Every structure is written in C-alpha cells, then in structure tokens.
Amino acid sequence: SGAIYVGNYRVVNRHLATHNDWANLVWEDSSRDLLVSSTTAQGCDTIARCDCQTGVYYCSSRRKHYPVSFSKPSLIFVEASEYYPARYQSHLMLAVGHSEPGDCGGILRCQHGVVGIVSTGGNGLVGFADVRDLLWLDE
Numbered sequence: 738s739g740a741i742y743v744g745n746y747r748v749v750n751r752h753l754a755t756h757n758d759w760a761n762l763v764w765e766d767s768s769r770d771l772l773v774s775s776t777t778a779q780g781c782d783t784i785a786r787c788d789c790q791t792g793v794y795y796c797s798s799r800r801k802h803y804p805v806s807f808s809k810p811s812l813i814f815v816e817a818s819e820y821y822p823a824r825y826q827s828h829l830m831l832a833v834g835h836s837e838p839g840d841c842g843g844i845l846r847c848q849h850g851v852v853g854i855v856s857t858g859g860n861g862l863v864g865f866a867d868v869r870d871l872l873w874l875d876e
C-alpha cells in the first residue's frame with residue numbers, strides 16, 4: 738500500500754483505489770495502473786521533473802529503502818492477475834530489487850522529488866509506474 742499526496746491530489750495504484758478515491762475521481766488510466774483523486778487537505782509530497790534513471794524506493798515487505806537503477810518509462814507486457822487481464826502496461830520502469838504482493842504504492846524518489854510508485858514485481862525485479870510526465874499534478 739501507499740500513495741503520493743501533492744497539492745489537492747492523491748495518486749494511488751488504480752488496482753488499490755478505494756470507494757472514496759472513485760467518488761472523488763480526477764483521472765484514471767488502466768494501462769498505467771494509476772488513479773488520481775481529489776483531497777481537501779494540502780499534500781506533503783513534491784514531484785520530480787527530470788530524466789533520472791537512479792533513485793531510492795521504499796520496500797514495505799522489508800521495512801527498508803533500497804537504491805536502484807531503473808529503465809526509462811516504456812510499454813511492458815504484464816501477465817494476467819486477479820486485477821487485470823494479460824496486457825501491456827505503459828509508462829512502466831523496471832529495476833532489479835525485491836518486491837512482493839503488498840509492496841505496491843511504495844514511493845521511488847530521486848534527488849529532485851517523487852518519480853513514481855511500485856506497481857509490478859517478481860523474481861528479483863520491481864516495476865514502477867512513472868508520474869513525472871503528469872505536469873498538471875503541480876497546478
């Protein structure tokens with residue numbers, strides 16, 4: 738679990754969005770596994786606007802942060818799960834690192850701010866949904 742809180746927005750994994758997220762929906766994209774809802778309180782986070790390919794992510798199944806080298810956002814095949822049919826997920830970045838069910842929502846950050854959130858994983862890999870192209874999150 739986990740979310741990004743920026744301005745009057747909450748960014749979560751679409752497959753983990755709550756009834757309240759859907760009732761306050763701003764934007765969602767099943768192909769990116771992202772959903773953004775509106776909040777009444779001002780958020781705690783700031784978003785990176787960069788092309789960093791190194792950063793640090795929070796891994797809840799180890800209660801630890803790990804440094805990672807990650808690929809540029811791209812279209813990657815994701816096998817069927819309880820949440821989605823087999824499909825290509827867009828704006829996804831892979832890295833070698835631990836992740837298991839429950840780790841989605843963990844934040845990936847570089848020196849410039851929040852880059853994205855854990856969205857996929859397995860076999861010593863961890864995949865992050867990028868948020869750096871969502872310029873409207875800042876206004």
Ligand SMILES: NC(=O)[C@H]1CCCN(C(=O)Nc2ccccc2SC2CC2)C1
Nearest residue numbers: 770815818820836837838856857858859
């Ligand atoms: N974005 C998606 O389509 C997600 C939806 C949730 C399921 N899924 C996924 O990869 N979950 C997962 C997360 C972290 C580590 C391992 C796993 S699955 C298995 C132990 C290796 C695909």
Ligand SMILES: [Zn+2]
Nearest residue numbers: 787789847849
């Ligand atoms: Zn950066």
